[PDB]
Structures are given as C-alpha cells and as structure tokens.
Amino acid sequence: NTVRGVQNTLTQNGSGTTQGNLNVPGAGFVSFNAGNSFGIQKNVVMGAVN
C-alpha cells in the first residue's frame, strides 16, 4: 500500500503533467498551468483560454 501511494504521488494519480505555455501579444511566451479540480483533460482546458 505504501509503495502504491508513493507511485501515485510520483505519477500524480496517473493524469500526467499539466505544464503549459501561452502566447501573450507583445510580452511573448509565458508559463501556464492547466491543472483543475474537475478532471477536464489538458487539451480541452486549453481550448477556451485560446
């Protein structure tokens, strides 16, 4: 159970990483995190912000 708990923390419950980027006029590229508490997959969250 402890091994599985450590693995879950490492892999983030199997959902994968959520780091991203944005295009801001003038300012250029900036960092952006797509994590959310409702389970919406990354490329779907990034749809409305664009």
Binding site: T2, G5, V6, N8, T9, L10
Partner: protein, 62 residues
C-alpha cells in the same frame, strides 16, 4: 504429512548441513536452535488509520 516433491532427500540434506555447521556447538543443538529461530519473530497486526496522517507520510516519499 505427504504430497511434497521428495521427503527423504530434504531430511538427508538437513542432517548433513547440521553436521557440517557444527565443525549450538553439537549437532543436536544445531537442530534444536534452527527451530527456536524462525518462530520468534513478533507478528504485525493491521489497524485503522486516519487518512490525513497516511497522505502526509506518502507525500514525503516521491
């Protein structure tokens, strides 16, 4: 009791090992102590836990 894959072979090997190691200072004592050990390990029991404490411990892993 029965059903295993060979019984005489294991006994005739254990006796030789017990004789060899004594070269717990006589062959009888090696047989006697081999069972005293392997049975003295205090067992662990399951118990209910508070969720928060376990998650804190697991987070210090990773």
């Amino acid at each position: 009791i029965g059903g295993g894959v060979g019984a005489l072979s294991k006994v005739s090997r254990a006796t030789r090992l017990a004789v060899g190691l004594s070269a717990t200072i006589t062959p009888l004592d090696v047989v006697g102590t081999s069972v005293g050990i392997a049975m003295s390990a205090i067992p662990g029991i399951r118990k209910v836990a508070k969720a928060e404490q376990v998650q804190q411990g697991a987070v210090r892993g990773g």
